[PDB]
Amino acid sequence: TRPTIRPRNDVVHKQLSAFGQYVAEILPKYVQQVQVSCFNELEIFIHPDGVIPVLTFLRDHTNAQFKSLADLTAVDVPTRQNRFEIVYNLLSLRFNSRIRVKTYTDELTPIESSVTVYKAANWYEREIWDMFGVFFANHPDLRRILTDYGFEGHPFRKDFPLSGYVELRYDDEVKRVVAEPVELAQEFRKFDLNSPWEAFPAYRQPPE
Amino acid sequence: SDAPPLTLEAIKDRVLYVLKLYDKIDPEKLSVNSHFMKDLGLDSLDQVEIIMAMEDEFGFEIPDIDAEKLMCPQEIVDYIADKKDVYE
Amino acid sequence: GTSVKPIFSRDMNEAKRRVRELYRAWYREVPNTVHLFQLDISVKQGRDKVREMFMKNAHVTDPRVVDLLVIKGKMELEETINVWKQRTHIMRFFHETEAPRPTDFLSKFYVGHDP
Amino acid sequence: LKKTTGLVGLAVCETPHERLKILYTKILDVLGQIPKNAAYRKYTEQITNEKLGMVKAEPDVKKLEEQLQGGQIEEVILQAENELSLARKMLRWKPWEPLVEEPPANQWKWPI
Amino acid sequence: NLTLNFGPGVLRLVMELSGEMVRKCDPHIGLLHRGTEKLIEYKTYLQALPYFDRLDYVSMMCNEQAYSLAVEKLLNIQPPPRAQWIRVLFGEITRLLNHIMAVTTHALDIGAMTPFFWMFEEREKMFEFYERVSGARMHAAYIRPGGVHQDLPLGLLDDIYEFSKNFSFRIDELEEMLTNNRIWRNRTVDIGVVTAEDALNYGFSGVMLRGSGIQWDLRKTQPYDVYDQVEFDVPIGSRGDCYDRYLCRVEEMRQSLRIISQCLNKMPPGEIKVDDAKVSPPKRAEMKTSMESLIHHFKLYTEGYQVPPGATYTAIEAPKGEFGVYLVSDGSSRPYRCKIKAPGFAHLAGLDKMSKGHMLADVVAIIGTQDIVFGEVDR
Amino acid sequence: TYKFVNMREPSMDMKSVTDRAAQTLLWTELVRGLGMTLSYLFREPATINYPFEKGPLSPRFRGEHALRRYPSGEERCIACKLCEAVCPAQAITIEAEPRADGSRRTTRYDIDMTKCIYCGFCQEACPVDAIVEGPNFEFSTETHEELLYNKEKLLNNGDKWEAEIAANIQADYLYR
Ligand SMILES: CCCCCCCCCCCC(=O)SCCNC(=O)CCNC(=O)[C@H](O)C(C)(C)COP(=O)(O)O
Ligand code: SF4
Ligand code: SF4
């Protein structure tokens, strides 16, 4: 491992693995899997019904006390039956650590809102509803936060076109700003940059 | 004339009048015993539209839990008679 | 099986009731919006547009889809109440500035390759 | 006695030993209703018993703060309250039960 | 109790007033939403790098550093020490630019407006340092996921030293005009008080934490580059009001000067990008004389480098607080997902809580002390 | 390590209380601020006399694009399309075909100056130093159309600026 390779820390890896086992032991009803990355990042995959309990545990247990909610986001993977993946990032100041909690959902299944646990989640949850269409139940007020008023569709889905469906301009006949079907003077050039000759054998998949 | 009690006749006249006010119902087909579905050809949206019009003239809020059962003008007039607590 | 988690309605009756309440709210609000935004349309046109937008989704037979649409409609109505939109946002529902696309085969054949 | 603990909204607690002992006793009493085999019960009982044994064996405050490894004893009382609330919520939730259900076939498979 | 819409950085604010007090204050955002996180998915990592300058345009090299750290963590590589020192030196310089901007803009919104020019002279000098190294005054794109793009010009360290030995007087003049002023104190003291527990729960970070008495700093608790090799102090407030945060920002400026001096004194020799031609492009002479170098230059500037699959969350102590990127890579040369966490989002979310029972004129002061730039808020 | 910014307890003796009362009643700090402003009034301003005086720049400056050529007179561009592929904003459009003598040359090279972000990726991805980002920055326009450069305009820019473009390239090419 020459100076061009990122150094590896084993103590943090062992500590994160031990804490993952500890958490999975405490809450066997909700946690479905625990992982520790090669760069010392611990993630926990749980059932959708365990959003409120597990988070509360990680915020209130004397040994976890993950006080801060750093980020909350969603990932769209259309090839999955449960399309959307919700990610919570928690930071514990007392133990100087970070954790990740992952949950799955689809278009029609709602996810219980975690505003009661973390207030910071509030706007984040709205953002998800604005960008992906995931509905959060028992939210103080759920509405669009980023897109234009009356915007149809959720832009951050993988099946949403990059340029959208409508474009704005100004019309003098009606003396106002109007929306028209989108027409581009130059079409967005699509590049097939992905190449054959796989680069990482460590991630090779079985040939089914 | 000043403020006589609401007769079961005047209520019927007012209900029938505001029914004629509807643009989708012609005066030569509806009756007091007519049904909104098959004798006049309306779906639920006109029914709520009709109900809303009645509320405005009458002045009393009608809950949705029991406004779906006002299916013909007969039970409509019975409903305002019961709500206004008027006998004969 | 095919058991799913509800949103607001257990069956189609409750979803229909919520649709009815949303329609009542929109019907009541149309004249206030027309007066306040100083629209060029009449109340009759606004109510007709509300009816058309409601009947556009008349073929939905899933209570979850129906009450999600109800949630979206309630959000849009709330957006309209607080004057969060402007005249342009309200008037985008009518496409007064877009040319009318034809429907028959011959016109579409003449204009271009669009099927 | 120290004043202005330094954290805004956190008040200075006079006689923190009694408050800590009461809170730990209440935490143990609530934990007593959780089933024995639950990992939460044994882990939290061990932690609370260790903290109670350390708080009962030190009359000083600064040395107790150093030993507890939490610092600023008032926030240790705050964390005790948080743990008590979590224990009650957990007794309500009952998360020691088996898994609700397995995820779909390739729910967590990455890439794709 | 009337409702009013302060309409069109640029912001829309719907608030209810009961006389002079503020009852509810709801900020409407989306006026600068361009969809950066979706446009990133259609670009390679190098092509997606410049978006982060546009993210927070008051602190640009910090965003570059955050993205570079995330990509390096995914790639399992590390930059040479000189690149890290340049990153740290530039990061400190950028912090000064951000703090000058925030303090002067807050004062100008209050109504002082003289320190704005006084310190924008120094901001212009800092632009020159940014310009000399990368050819751009503001949108630099200097910091790359392999290190830095180019080495320093031969006369840059001397100029940085000459500039940085006269900045203390500028900070002293700013404090003279603002710190002890009774009007400024009345405008700022005991305004927008936030408790430590509420600040933690509401997701606040940076000065908003440190102003409330919380001893937290990502450069000290979780150093990333050469920070564990530089000594500096972390200002901590005691009341959580606007005045404490202003004092914290001034002290952070002074500590940034300290770190800049340390970085200037302890500059090491060596290369400026990782000696891995499959990640960092080779030199022009090597490209024009060597076959492997030409092939690697071609493939890096046409297709890009493949990042092993995985998801990471990398956070740094940007001048506005904790700035983070959640990057998901599927193994190709284009990121699958790039979520950006900006402290302005959480701060503006907590604005409504922080402006309870305050005058209308206090909302402007609270917004100024939040250090809100809407590029990062809207993304 | 950490510092306290607002942890000073004012003295409560008679002298300090009297000093604070005198400060309140006589406005000493306001006079100090006025004196600071007055002192700043009597020093030289930092304003330069544009356009007769110009702000300093460096050889690395990115400005208006140009297409260079070899000393013999042949254009350096070989239609490798690396600059088009590396452009983050997709502002470069290239079309090419064999020339009359079989040389690999472009038939169309368009840069949309209203789409370009002036990041310099194009000039550093070029293997023959064909496309360069020149040092000119005063090229504002009264209409949108004239900001859509084609091959003729870029070649004219190269022929116009080649002197100082080559000087800057000579000054800076050892850092690349
Ligand atoms: C002034 C500008 C106006 C702008 C207008 C904005 C439009 C807002 C749109 C609100 C959101 C929706 O559409 S909510 C979508 C509504 N959902 C459904 O309709 C599903 C089930 N549909 C049915 O049951 C029948 O079609 C039905 C005829 C509805 C019932 O007839 P009856 O019960 O009688 O039998
Ligand atoms: S400077 Fe950047 S955006 Fe502009 S043409 Fe070159 S590569 Fe494209
Ligand atoms: S990179 Fe240079 S040689 Fe290649 S197409 Fe662009 S300008 Fe021509």
Side-chain angles (χ1 to χ4, degrees), chain A, chain B residues 3-43 45-81 86, chain C, chain D, chain E, chain F:
Chain A
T1 40
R2 286 270 56 78
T4 58
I5 299 196
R6 171 186 171 91
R8 208 146 264 201
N9 194 349
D10 298 319
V11 185
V12 180
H13 196 268
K14 253 102 73 173
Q15 288 165 357
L16 290 178
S17 312
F19 186 66
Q21 288 182 351
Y22 168 87
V23 166
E25 282 166 11
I26 279 167
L27 316 149
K29 186 183 175 194
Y30 302 118
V31 53
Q32 301 170 350
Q33 204 178 349
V34 181
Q35 274 175 11
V36 187
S37 307
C38 95
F39 38 84
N40 312 143
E41 289 207 5
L42 170 75
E43 52 226 89
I44 300 180
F45 316 86
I46 72 171
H47 200 261
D49 294 308
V51 169
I52 298 298
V54 170
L55 284 189
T56 307
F57 172 81
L58 288 161
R59 192 203 69 185
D60 280 347
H61 191 50
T62 314
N63 264 5
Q65 43 189 343
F66 285 80
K67 245 52 174 282
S68 214
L69 171 75
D71 192 31
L72 162 55
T73 179
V75 186
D76 186 1
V77 191
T79 185
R80 287 165 176 175
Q81 177 216 144
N82 282 325
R83 198 192 163 155
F84 307 112
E85 152 177 324
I86 314 298
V87 182
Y88 302 81
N89 281 284
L90 319 176
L91 158 75
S92 175
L93 286 85
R94 175 67 52 213
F95 299 109
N96 200 1
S97 296
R98 292 182 182 277
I99 211 172
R100 188 176 324 139
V101 173
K102 282 207 251 220
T103 295
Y104 53 83
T105 185
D106 63 37
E107 297 95 332
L108 307 176
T109 308
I111 276 184
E112 195 64 28
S113 180
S114 59
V115 173
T116 58
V117 195
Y118 298 104
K119 242 77 74 195
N122 189 341
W123 271 20
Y124 284 115
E125 254 149 24
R126 273 168 69 186
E127 206 218 59
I128 292 175
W129 164 257
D130 210 324
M131 296 291 112
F132 295 90
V134 174
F135 181 73
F136 287 96
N138 301 315
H139 197 270
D141 64 323
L142 192 65
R143 47 178 170 99
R144 81 171 75 256
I145 187 183
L146 284 174
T147 51
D148 196 335
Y149 304 114
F151 190 87
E152 285 246 29
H154 308 283
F156 276 12
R157 287 178 179 186
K158 305 296 281 187
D159 47 328
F160 198 81
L162 172 74
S163 298
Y165 294 104
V166 299
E167 62 159 19
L168 257 58
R169 71 173 183 85
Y170 180 76
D171 210 276
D172 202 10
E173 179 210 281
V174 293
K175 294 267 193 311
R176 75 172 175 268
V177 167
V178 298
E180 313 244 335
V182 60
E183 294 200 11
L184 300 155
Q186 195 186 17
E187 182 194 18
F188 179 79
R189 274 88 59 81
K190 182 182 63 162
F191 288 166
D192 282 303
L193 308 171
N194 221 3
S195 85
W197 301 114
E198 79 165 0
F200 317 110
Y203 293 87
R204 191 186 300 134
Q205 265 158 140
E208 50 82 20
Chain B
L6 270 295
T7 90
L8 280 244
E9 206 264 346
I11 287 185
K12 200 194 50 62
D13 293 281
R14 284 233 298 300
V15 162
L16 255 298
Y17 176 52
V18 300
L19 257 293
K20 322 326 208 63
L21 258 295
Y22 212 67
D23 315 302
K24 198 168 295 127
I25 294 187
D26 87 282
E28 278 86 7
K29 169 86 145 313
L30 86 163
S31 66
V32 181
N33 224 5
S34 65
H35 206 72
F36 284 137
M37 314 342 284
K38 77 149 67 68
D39 322 324
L40 305 153
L42 309 183
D43 38 8
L45 296 192
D46 321 282
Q47 208 292 122
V48 317
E49 281 189 8
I50 284 91
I51 295 300
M52 285 187 295
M54 308 288 66
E55 273 183 308
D56 173 14
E57 156 134 340
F58 278 82
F60 72 101
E61 188 80 300
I62 309 180
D64 198 288
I65 184 64
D66 90 352
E68 67 105 10
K69 317 176 315 332
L70 285 38
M71 217 64 234
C72 51
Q74 283 292 349
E75 46 216 62
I76 274 189
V77 197
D78 314 352
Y79 180 83
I80 313 88
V86 291
Chain C
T2 71
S3 296
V4 290
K5 225 189 73 84
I7 299 172
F8 277 145
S9 307
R10 207 89 28 191
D11 53 354
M12 270 300 268
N13 295 352
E14 310 187 1
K16 283 180 180 288
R17 177 208 137 231
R18 288 161 183 289
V19 171
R20 271 192 301 277
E21 316 200 290
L22 184 58
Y23 185 85
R24 302 257 270 287
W26 266 107
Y27 195 86
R28 284 301 179 57
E29 178 64 38
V30 159
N32 286 1
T33 278
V34 167
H35 160 82
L36 196 97
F37 280 98
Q38 315 226 264
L39 298 201
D40 190 72
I41 66 182
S42 47
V43 184
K44 172 72 162 62
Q45 293 185 30
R47 269 146 176 180
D48 280 357
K49 175 61 69 168
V50 169
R51 193 72 146 300
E52 171 187 20
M53 299 285 297
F54 262 83
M55 293 270 327
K56 169 174 323 321
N57 303 2
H59 58 68
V60 180
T61 75
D62 192 319
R64 293 179 302 169
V65 184
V66 172
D67 69 8
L68 212 61
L69 284 169
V70 161
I71 285 166
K72 267 142 164 259
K74 253 182 298 153
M75 287 182 14
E76 162 132 4
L77 172 79
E78 148 188 59
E79 229 161 273
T80 308
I81 302 310
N82 306 57
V83 199
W84 289 342
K85 312 176 148 211
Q86 293 105 345
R87 316 190 47 256
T88 173
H89 289 89
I90 292 293
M91 278 288 231
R92 290 198 192 125
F93 280 110
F94 294 84
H95 316 105
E96 316 187 314
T97 206
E98 316 185 11
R101 319 281 326 271
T103 318
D104 62 324
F105 186 91
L106 255 287
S107 301
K108 289 192 286 186
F109 173 81
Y110 288 144
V111 280
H113 313 89
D114 207 16
Chain D
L1 182 63
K2 71 153 200 281
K3 49 99 179 177
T4 71
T5 171
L7 281 305
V8 176
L10 197 77
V12 176
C13 192
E14 316 67 359
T15 82
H17 285 68
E18 322 320 324
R19 193 53 205 287
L20 272 181
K21 283 192 278 194
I22 288 174
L23 277 165
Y24 290 149
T25 278
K26 298 183 54 163
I27 290 173
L28 287 157
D29 266 9
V30 181
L31 280 172
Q33 336 198 341
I34 306 207
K36 267 74 68 178
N37 47 8
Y40 184 67
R41 197 196 147 146
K42 44 177 65 69
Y43 283 134
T44 321
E45 273 169 351
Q46 161 191 158
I47 295 169
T48 324
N49 286 326
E50 181 167 341
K51 278 176 170 61
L52 198 43
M54 287 191 344
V55 74
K56 269 177 172 170
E58 185 65 39
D60 205 342
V61 178
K62 305 229 94 53
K63 310 169 62 93
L64 179 63
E65 270 178 358
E66 194 125 350
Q67 267 168 51
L68 262 176
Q69 268 320 311
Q72 222 57 354
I73 197 76
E74 296 91 13
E75 68 197 2
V76 184
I77 287 103
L78 188 45
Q79 189 36 201
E81 304 163 39
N82 274 338
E83 182 69 75
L84 174 54
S85 147
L86 169 70
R88 260 191 277 265
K89 267 162 195 213
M90 279 252 166
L91 175 58
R92 200 257 308 310
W93 280 326
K94 303 164 176 326
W96 39 87
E97 312 183 333
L99 182 64
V100 180
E101 63 177 325
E102 296 306 320
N106 293 16
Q107 188 53 50
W108 301 121
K109 173 175 168 284
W110 195 249
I112 214 84
Chain E
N1 197 321
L2 85 158
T3 177
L4 71 91
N5 321 48
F6 281 148
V10 70
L11 170 61
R12 175 144 191 235
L13 212 67
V14 202
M15 40 211 315
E16 327 169 43
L17 295 186
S18 89
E20 290 269 288
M21 314 336 287
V22 172
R23 282 337 179 173
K24 197 206 262 143
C25 190
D26 166 62
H28 284 240
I29 66 170
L31 298 175
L32 203 65
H33 172 67
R34 319 99 128 193
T36 295
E37 310 183 8
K38 183 162 196 61
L39 286 161
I40 284 172
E41 304 164 8
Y42 288 85
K43 322 271 181 194
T44 74
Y45 293 87
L46 183 60
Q47 281 190 318
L49 170 75
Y51 273 110
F52 287 75
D53 312 339
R54 279 89 189 152
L55 269 206
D56 181 13
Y57 40 85
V58 184
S59 54
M60 306 120 286
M61 304 261 216
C62 291
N63 313 153
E64 287 159 357
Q65 191 177 14
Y67 180 64
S68 304
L69 287 175
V71 178
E72 284 158 29
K73 190 178 306 181
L74 276 182
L75 280 168
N76 199 5
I77 66 160
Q78 65 159 346
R82 186 175 173 96
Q84 297 176 324
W85 280 104
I86 295 179
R87 282 181 174 182
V88 166
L89 161 61
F90 270 84
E92 294 321 331
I93 290 193
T94 214
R95 179 173 310 272
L96 282 181
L97 281 158
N98 168 104
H99 283 337
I100 279 184
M101 173 105 180
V103 170
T104 44
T105 298
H106 188 190
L108 159 64
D109 288 327
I110 297 301
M113 94 169 159
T114 312
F116 169 88
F117 305 93
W118 289 2
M119 307 292 275
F120 265 40
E121 191 48 48
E122 311 299 306
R123 267 194 56 114
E124 191 84 28
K125 285 194 208 80
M126 269 147 181
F127 272 178
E128 288 184 327
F129 299 148
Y130 261 57
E131 191 288 335
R132 291 179 69 181
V133 65
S134 70
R137 277 160 56 94
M138 173 165 0
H139 288 324
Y142 187 60
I143 296 178
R144 305 271 169 101
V148 300
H149 174 42
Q150 268 184 111
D151 210 327
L152 312 170
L154 270 181
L156 189 61
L157 287 198
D158 295 350
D159 283 46
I160 291 184
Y161 166 72
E162 293 295 300
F163 156 84
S164 73
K165 58 181 260 298
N166 306 311
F167 195 62
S168 175
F169 272 179
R170 313 285 93 79
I171 312 179
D172 294 335
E173 290 168 2
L174 169 63
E175 283 203 273
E176 214 37 65
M177 286 276 338
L178 278 189
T179 287
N180 282 312
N181 208 15
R182 89 182 53 194
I183 313 177
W184 178 256
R185 285 185 56 101
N186 289 359
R187 281 309 285 275
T188 42
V189 161
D190 267 21
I191 301 294
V193 176
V194 54
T195 68
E197 269 333 290
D198 291 76
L200 272 179
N201 193 262
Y202 270 84
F204 293 172
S205 58
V207 183
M208 323 276 294
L209 284 201
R210 286 188 285 285
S212 291
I214 311 176
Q215 316 183 352
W216 183 251
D217 194 303
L218 289 185
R219 296 173 287 167
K220 280 297 190 63
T221 62
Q222 300 174 358
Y224 28 96
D225 284 345
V226 292
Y227 281 111
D228 44 354
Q229 297 185 48
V230 287
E231 61 161 14
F232 70 103
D233 298 351
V234 174
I236 303 289
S238 296
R239 327 189 49 69
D241 45 357
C242 298
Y243 195 66
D244 271 17
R245 301 186 206 105
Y246 155 82
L247 292 170
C248 285
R249 292 212 176 84
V250 177
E251 191 53 42
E252 277 182 356
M253 273 199 261
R254 300 187 184 281
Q255 300 311 314
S256 278
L257 262 183
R258 195 167 161 192
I259 303 176
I260 286 173
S261 164
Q262 284 174 65
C263 276
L264 287 176
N265 255 32
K266 293 164 60 177
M267 197 57 156
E271 79 277 8
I272 53 105
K273 52 184 58 167
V274 54
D275 220 352
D276 194 14
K278 316 220 174 189
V279 177
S280 280
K283 303 207 201 153
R284 310 272 292 176
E286 287 169 29
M287 178 257 289
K288 297 186 184 195
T289 60
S290 176
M291 179 78 249
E292 281 84 354
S293 303
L294 182 61
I295 284 171
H296 285 65
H297 171 100
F298 190 104
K299 292 302 287 190
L300 285 181
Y301 276 107
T302 58
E303 143 151 11
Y305 43 82
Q306 292 86 19
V307 168
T312 182
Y313 173 81
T314 287
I316 76 157
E317 183 66 44
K320 286 174 167 54
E322 172 172 357
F323 177 85
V325 47
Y326 180 64
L327 199 59
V328 180
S329 170
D330 52 356
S332 44
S333 61
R334 294 192 275 214
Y336 193 81
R337 173 97 175 114
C338 189
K339 164 68 162 57
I340 300 154
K341 173 256 170 42
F345 205 62
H347 298 170
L348 202 60
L351 173 278
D352 191 7
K353 155 106 167 173
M354 249 199 298
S355 79
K356 267 304 181 288
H358 278 298
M359 303 288 180
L360 191 85
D362 284 18
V363 178
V364 165
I366 293 161
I367 274 161
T369 201
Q370 260 166 190
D371 202 341
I372 296 308
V373 160
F374 285 85
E376 71 170 6
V377 172
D378 291 77
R379 286 155 291 118
Chain F
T1 70
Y2 69 107
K3 293 168 50 153
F4 280 121
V5 286
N6 217 26
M7 263 285 219
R8 290 305 200 131
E9 282 215 79
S11 178
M12 270 326 264
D13 57 346
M14 200 54 210
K15 183 179 187 294
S16 294
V17 169
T18 311
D19 285 4
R20 289 202 296 283
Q23 179 177 2
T24 294
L25 286 179
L26 309 183
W27 318 334
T28 63
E29 82 273 11
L30 308 184
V31 170
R32 222 144 83 91
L34 287 179
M36 168 58 74
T37 303
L38 174 86
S39 72
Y40 209 106
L41 180 137
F42 280 106
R43 52 179 98 173
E44 208 188 331
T47 303
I48 68 177
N49 192 46
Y50 189 82
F52 309 94
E53 283 136 77
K54 304 292 191 72
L57 288 179
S58 66
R60 307 190 187 185
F61 182 72
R62 311 174 202 146
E64 163 177 55
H65 295 73
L67 280 176
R68 309 180 56 221
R69 60 177 73 205
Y70 287 108
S72 55
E74 166 128 17
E75 30 176 340
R76 290 176 171 256
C77 186
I78 50 177
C80 74
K81 282 174 199 83
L82 262 63
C83 58
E84 181 182 2
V86 84
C87 181
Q90 294 218 340
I92 300 181
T93 303
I94 306 177
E95 295 209 8
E97 90 181 11
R99 219 168 49 185
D101 54 338
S103 211
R104 189 183 166 116
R105 284 304 173 287
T106 43
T107 65
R108 163 213 293 281
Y109 192 97
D110 305 353
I111 295 184
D112 175 335
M113 290 318 228
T114 61
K115 267 199 265 199
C116 171
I117 76 180
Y118 303 84
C119 58
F121 285 4
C122 54
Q123 80 165 334
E124 83 193 18
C126 190
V128 294
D129 302 25
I131 183 72
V132 81
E133 204 159 2
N136 180 28
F137 57 90
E138 293 144 304
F139 60 111
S140 312
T141 312
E142 296 193 15
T143 52
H144 196 168
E145 285 86 55
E146 319 168 36
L147 280 176
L148 266 52
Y149 289 7
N150 62 358
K151 193 183 177 180
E152 314 297 325
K153 180 79 169 83
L154 295 159
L155 274 180
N156 281 9
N157 281 353
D159 298 339
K160 174 173 164 188
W161 294 100
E162 183 52 39
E164 142 184 347
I165 282 182
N168 280 337
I169 277 166
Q170 163 75 39
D172 182 274
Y173 88 106
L174 275 175
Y175 299 98
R176 300 168 184 187

